[PDB]
Nucleic acid binder design. Structure first.
Ligand SMILES: [Mg+2]
Ligand SMILES: [Mg+2]
Ligand SMILES: [Mg+2]
Ligand SMILES: [Mg+2]
Ligand SMILES: [Mg+2]
Ligand SMILES: [Mg+2]
Ligand SMILES: [Mg+2]
Ligand SMILES: [Mg+2]
Ligand SMILES: [Mg+2]
Ligand SMILES: [Mg+2]
Ligand SMILES: [Mg+2]
Ligand SMILES: [Mg+2]
Ligand SMILES: [Mg+2]
Ligand SMILES: [Mg+2]
Ligand SMILES: [Mg+2]
Ligand SMILES: [Mg+2]
Ligand SMILES: [Mg+2]
Ligand SMILES: [Mg+2]
Ligand SMILES: [Mg+2]
Ligand SMILES: [Mg+2]
Ligand SMILES: [Mg+2]
Ligand SMILES: [Mg+2]
Ligand SMILES: [Mg+2]
Ligand SMILES: [Mg+2]
Ligand SMILES: [Mg+2]
Ligand SMILES: [Mg+2]
Ligand SMILES: [Mg+2]
Ligand SMILES: [Mg+2]
Ligand SMILES: [Mg+2]
Ligand SMILES: [Mg+2]
Ligand SMILES: [Mg+2]
Ligand SMILES: [Mg+2]
Ligand SMILES: [Mg+2]
Ligand SMILES: [Mg+2]
Ligand SMILES: [Mg+2]
Ligand SMILES: [Mg+2]
Ligand SMILES: [Mg+2]
Ligand SMILES: [Mg+2]
Ligand SMILES: [Mg+2]
Ligand SMILES: [Mg+2]
Ligand SMILES: [Mg+2]
Ligand SMILES: [Mg+2]
Ligand SMILES: [Mg+2]
Ligand SMILES: [Mg+2]
Ligand SMILES: [Mg+2]
Ligand SMILES: [Mg+2]
Ligand SMILES: [Mg+2]
Ligand SMILES: [Mg+2]
Ligand SMILES: [Mg+2]
Ligand SMILES: [Mg+2]
Ligand SMILES: [Mg+2]
Ligand SMILES: [Mg+2]
Ligand SMILES: [Mg+2]
Ligand SMILES: [Mg+2]
Ligand SMILES: [Mg+2]
Ligand SMILES: [Mg+2]
Ligand SMILES: [Mg+2]
Ligand SMILES: [Mg+2]
Ligand SMILES: [Mg+2]
Ligand SMILES: [Mg+2]
Ligand SMILES: [Mg+2]
Ligand SMILES: [Mg+2]
Ligand SMILES: [Mg+2]
Lengths: 177, 66, 79, 115
RNA sequence: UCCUCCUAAAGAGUAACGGAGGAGCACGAAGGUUGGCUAAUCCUGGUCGGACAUCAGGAGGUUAGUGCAAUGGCAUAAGCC
RNA sequence: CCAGGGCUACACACGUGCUACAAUGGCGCAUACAAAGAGAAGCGACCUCGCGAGAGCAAGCGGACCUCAUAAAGUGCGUCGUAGUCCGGAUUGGAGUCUGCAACUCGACUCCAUGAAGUCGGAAUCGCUAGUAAUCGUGGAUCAGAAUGCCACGGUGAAUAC
RNA sequence: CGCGGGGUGGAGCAGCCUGGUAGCUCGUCGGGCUCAUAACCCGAAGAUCGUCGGUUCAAAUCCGGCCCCCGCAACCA
């Protein structure tokens, strides 16, 4: 909520002076944060997915989608339409609420932290983080989980390049290397 | 959002040991207690203290001193 | 490691370094003193340490100081 | 029970609670609790939350966890780059402190192999 | 015995112990209809996770798919929900 | 005769040890009891510094007197509550100490952090008939330095032998 | 040339004509027992399945060629 109001007032005005944008809409805005959790090991144990679903449902506000396998492959021993991973495509109000909660308190709680990767862009301003543990978020109780599982955060923007997209995230006091 | 299916997304107060009080909204419960935040974490000083560790010649000179 | 009362180098090597350093960079120094330590003044020299049957050239760098010369010369060959 | 990088023990004495921290042992933990002004017989389950904050600043003085692991990794990786006797010993996977390598050395060398 | 292509000479038909492949079913949803949807395969970033499981964006655009061989056909989608 | 290097190599195999795998115990303060030695370019108090190896100044003794020398098990109060653990203490990094012209190949010990295998061992198989086995110290010889070996010493102290 | 059948640790056989993780018996290797060798006892490794290709999500197993091996036919004048 607050970071959205901060973005509208403080950030845009900062970003306009950098690349001398003609219009206010030209500034890159954060479209959606997609929290993904390819549990994978759900082939053997079916409940292990439903455990991950509860952990994503705890981490994010909303309940996750159970993504099916797109195509059958023998390397992992999976078939067409088999539930292999969990996902959340959170956007809008709860997105800005989660984005605060990620960068302000969770990212600090990473074990052996130093500085997040600057090179990690797709060549179109869309960022992604790979958190190893679930414990870094304060939602999960310590004596509840019993697996070293994690998720990946995926920040989608309206930017046309990583050089342009880095500034947007950098304006939120985001930690880079 | 679809009502019923989601968990209870309630407002809560984060209060770290540093002093930075901060209200947020999440599926935790009543209250929070934190160790570090975006402020007060050693990354701005961490990189300064980490990178400047090496130095072998002075370590020899500290023993001999002549 | 041993010795607080001054890091140890053989007289003949200390002289040979001091004579080589003041003159300039020339060639590898034929030295049998492995036992001796490495000083800061030795940096730049490509001194040749006796491995057992032959001399092994060692270009002395910023890090090669606290360590002795015999460490940069494997005696027993394996495979 | 959340100081330093990890430290989350429960039903354990405060001295031995801090042994689980990487970079702190039996003797160092007595020095932490002596400086903080905390009894060693108590546990973190029975102790106050404001009194845990005193332990956080005390362990910050010493080098611990991710600071220490890399300081060890740096010193080991340094030796290998120099190409010294210990540096060869490290990357080869054989014992360093002039130990016997013929009969034993199984800890460093790893378990038994065929011929 | 039945289906598909060529042989078959620009309608149909057309033989040979000529050339290549399939069928003796399947399904109460894989039918109906309504209302939606768009693929392959790569590129780059990202926890375990690696070429490839799941995610994001970009590239290509039907190389895809069509319960089953081949032929002809399908975005108005006959494709997938 | 001399400088270094080697006897300390290491895909492996075995011998003989030691330390383990714990709760009949491990960690903590705190208490009582030995014997046999040894010392003269030796053994070296008490002091003062040392986190500790040790460092200076030096007391006495060729010794029933002086010193290395607080024996440890064992008790008595805690605290841990069966974990790869406050078990094990390997291995690595750093910082050191003495000896010695010199400690990297290739020493010993100390401190700090580190915390490997191992949860009583396959076929087999060894020693032991009472102060014996078992377990905890201690000393000496060679020895500048370098024992888990060797040679001695004494603690608590069994079962079983139809 | 025609129609069956094969080709799997070093050896001989299962698993192969019903597609998903390769056994058995000897032999080799390590350790025991023995004065030593054998026998005996206890552990251990060792085959991507003739080869080259298809289909398949995946082939020792389905289908096609080629390469060997083995059986049966190769007749009436
Ligand atoms: Mg040692
Ligand atoms: Mg040795
Ligand atoms: Mg040794
Ligand atoms: Mg073994
Ligand atoms: Mg007919
Ligand atoms: Mg025609
Ligand atoms: Mg015609
Ligand atoms: Mg026609
Ligand atoms: Mg006709
Ligand atoms: Mg047919
Ligand atoms: Mg249909
Ligand atoms: Mg329709
Ligand atoms: Mg097609
Ligand atoms: Mg078709
Ligand atoms: Mg129709
Ligand atoms: Mg239909
Ligand atoms: Mg000699
Ligand atoms: Mg020998
Ligand atoms: Mg032998
Ligand atoms: Mg033998
Ligand atoms: Mg053995
Ligand atoms: Mg026991
Ligand atoms: Mg212990
Ligand atoms: Mg006594
Ligand atoms: Mg006597
Ligand atoms: Mg003396
Ligand atoms: Mg003596
Ligand atoms: Mg003294
Ligand atoms: Mg002495
Ligand atoms: Mg005394
Ligand atoms: Mg006295
Ligand atoms: Mg003192
Ligand atoms: Mg002091
Ligand atoms: Mg007197
Ligand atoms: Mg008297
Ligand atoms: Mg003593
Ligand atoms: Mg006395
Ligand atoms: Mg005393
Ligand atoms: Mg007790
Ligand atoms: Mg146990
Ligand atoms: Mg462990
Ligand atoms: Mg432990
Ligand atoms: Mg310990
Ligand atoms: Mg050791
Ligand atoms: Mg002395
Ligand atoms: Mg002495
Ligand atoms: Mg000690
Ligand atoms: Mg184990
Ligand atoms: Mg027993
Ligand atoms: Mg025992
Ligand atoms: Mg035997
Ligand atoms: Mg007898
Ligand atoms: Mg003992
Ligand atoms: Mg002894
Ligand atoms: Mg002696
Ligand atoms: Mg001694
Ligand atoms: Mg014929
Ligand atoms: Mg044999
Ligand atoms: Mg074995
Ligand atoms: Mg086997
Ligand atoms: Mg096997
Ligand atoms: Mg197979
Ligand atoms: Mg006839």
């Amino acid at each position: 909520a607050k970071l959205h109001d901060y973005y509208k007032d403080e950030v845009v005005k900062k970003l306009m002076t950098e690349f001398n944008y003609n219009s206010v809409m030209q500034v890159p805005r954060v479209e959606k944060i997609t929290l993904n959790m390819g549990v994978g090991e759900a082939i053997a144990d079916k409940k292990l997915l439903d455990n991950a679903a509860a952990d994503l449902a705890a981490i994010s506000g909303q309940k996750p989608l159970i993504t099916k396998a797109r195509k059958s492959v023998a390397g992992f021993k999976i078939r067409q339409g088999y539930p292999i991973g969990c996902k959340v495509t959170l956007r809008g109000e709860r997105m800005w609420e989660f984005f605060e909660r990620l960068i302000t308190i969770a990212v600090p709680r990473i074990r052996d932290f130093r500085g997040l990767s600057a090179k990690s862009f797709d060549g179109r301003g869309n960022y992604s983080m790979g958190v190893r543990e679930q414990i870094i978020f304060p939602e999960i109780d310590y004596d509840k989980v019993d697996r070293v599982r994690g998720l990946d955060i995926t920040i989608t923007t309206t930017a046309k390049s990583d050089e342009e997209g880095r500034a947007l995230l950098a304006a939120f006091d985001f930690p880079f290397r | 959002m679809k009502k019923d299916i989601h968990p209870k997304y309630e407002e809560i107060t984060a209060s770290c040991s540093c002093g930075n009080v901060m209200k947020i909204r999440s599926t935790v419960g009543h209250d929070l207690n934190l160790d570090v935040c975006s402020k007060c974490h050693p990354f701005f000083t961490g990189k300064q203290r980490d990178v400047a560790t090496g130095g072998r010649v002075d370590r020899f000179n500290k023993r001999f001193n002549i | 490691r041993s010795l607080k009362k001054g890091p140890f180098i053989d007289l003949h090597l200390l002289k040979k370094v001091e004579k080589a350093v003041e003159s300039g960079d020339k060639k590898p120094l034929r030295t049998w003193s492995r036992r001796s330590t490495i000083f800061p003044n030795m940096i730049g020299l490509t001194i040749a340490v006796h491995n057992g049957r032959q001399h092994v050239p060692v270009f002395v760098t910023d890090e090669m100081v606290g360590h002795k010369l015999g460490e940069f010369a494997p005696t027993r060959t394996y495979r | 029970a959340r100081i330093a990088g990890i430290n989350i023990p429960d039903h354990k004495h405060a001295v031995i609670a801090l042994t689980s921290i990487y970079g702190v042992g039996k003797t160092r933990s007595k020095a932490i609790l002596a400086a903080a002004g905390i009894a060693e017989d108590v546990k973190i389950s029975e102790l106050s939350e404001g009194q845990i904050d005193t332990l956080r600043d005390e362990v910050a003085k010493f080098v611990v966890e991710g600071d220490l692991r890399r300081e060890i990794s740096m010193s080991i990786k340094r030796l290998m780059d120099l190409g010294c006797y210990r540096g060869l010993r490290h990357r080869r996977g054989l014992p360093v402190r002039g130990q016997r390598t013929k009969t034993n050395a199984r800890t460093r060398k790893g378990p038994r192999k065929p011929i």
